[PDB]
Ligand binder design. Structure first.
Ligand code: HEM
Ligand SMILES: [Ca+2]
Ligand SMILES: [Ca+2]
Length: 329
């Protein structure tokens, strides 16, 4: 099919997505930047979709977190999610797209803004949300590895898939984990979708980045960087450690596994065969910037070898003394 200006798309239905693309790039993503709203939008795709259980209920990737926002944004596990829900609501109302479609579309478009990012498949046609998600379906950073893997598994994700989805934390920061110091990222490159998150979580912890250890927080190897306890444990757990370590300096795998598993997550509670493939609408992301490295002042001795099958790859450290991670703008 073709759109008004002759651009090819596999289905004519996808043409309605282009004005939505332009509007969000300009008015949600601050001129197609990989910034705060991109990160919050990626996070929202998860908080919307993970509200899904074959036995416990929830319609999954159905836009319920927007359509029933007063209920869902008040779940303890959804702390801080109100701001991005509130920012996205006018776009949903203004455009001719369901809330479930908009959330996943905004996430895929956002990721395409990030250097090293990957194009996530996108399907159009999710119905309006039917009911609010049940509470207690969103994993929390203080949950045990077994609890987290059981909840994600109930939703349909294997431990390896949990690792692949956690590539999202390569472009991520926290406001609620430690309320005193908002905007500390989970890796040293929160604006670059790269392997630094998997490297840095495997380093021996050194400090608590604020003035307090908070619930759900582990020791961080870097000042200005925050480490979730869930990430700390998943990096090292036998169920996940070899998968975690394999992401290190493996950009093609990070991209490929993230795209595939995000697509699967965006379809929770949905039937892809009743939807329309509009993947070709998502822009090509900019290429990776920077390279895999240990932070400056670190050596391979700082790695906590958790994978038994294979040793950590022999990365080199950035030059100079150990430095802090600047807060995200
Ligand atoms: C599997 C268990 C997970 C846990 C326990 C977890 C936990 C967290 C926490 C505590 C935050 C910080 C919230 C705050 O204080 O502001 C966060 C941020 C974030 N999460 Fe995860 N997460 C998980 C999985 C995922 C998945 C599957 C995605 C996929 C899209 C994702 C995407 C993000 C993003 C992009 C941010 C950054 C938000 C921002 O920069 O504003 N997370 N996560
Ligand atoms: Ca939902
Ligand atoms: Ca990064």
């Amino acid at each position: 099919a073709t759109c008004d200006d002759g651009r090819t798309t596999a289905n004519a239905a996808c043409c309605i997505l282009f004005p939505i693309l332009d509007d969000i790039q300009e008015n949600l993503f601050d001129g197609a930047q990989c910034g705060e709203k991109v990160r919050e939008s990626l996070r929202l795709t998860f908080h919307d979709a993970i509200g899904f259980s074959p036995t416990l209920g929830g319609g999954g990737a159905d836009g319920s977190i927007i359509a029933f926002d007063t209920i869902e944004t008040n779940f303890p596990a959804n702390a801080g999610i109100d701001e991005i829900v509130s920012a996205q609501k006018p776009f949903v109302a203004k455009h001719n797209i369901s809330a479930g479609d908009f959330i996943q579309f905004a996430g895929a478009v956002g990721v395409s803004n990030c250097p090293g990012g990957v194009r996530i498949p996108f399907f159009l046609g999710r119905p309006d949300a039917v009911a609010a998600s049940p509470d207690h379906l969103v994993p929390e950073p203080f949950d045990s590895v077994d609890s987290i893997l059981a909840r994600m598994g109930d939703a349909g994700f294997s431990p390896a898939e949990v690792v692949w989805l956690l590539a999202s934390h390569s472009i991520a920061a926290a406001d609620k984990v430690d309320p005193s110091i908002p905007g500390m990222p989970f890796d040293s490159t929160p604006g670059v979708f790269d392997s630094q998150f998997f490297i840095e979580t495997l380093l021996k912890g050194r400090l608590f980045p604020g003035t307090a250890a908070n619930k759900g927080e582990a020791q961080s190897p870097l000042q200005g960087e925050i480490r979730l306890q869930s990430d700390h444990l998943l990096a090292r757990d036998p169920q996940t450690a070899c998968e975690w370590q394999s992401m290190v300096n493996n950009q093609p795998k990070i991209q490929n596994r993230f795209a595939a598993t995000m697509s699967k997550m965006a379809l929770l509670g949905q039937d892809k065969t009743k939807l329309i493939d509009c993947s070709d609408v998502i822009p090509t992301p900019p290429a990776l910037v920077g390279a895999a490295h240990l932070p400056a002042g670190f050596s391979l001795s700082d790695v906590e070898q958790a994978c038994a099958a294979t040793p950590f790859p022999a990365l080199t450290a950035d030059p100079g003394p150990v430095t802090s991670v600047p807060p995200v703008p």
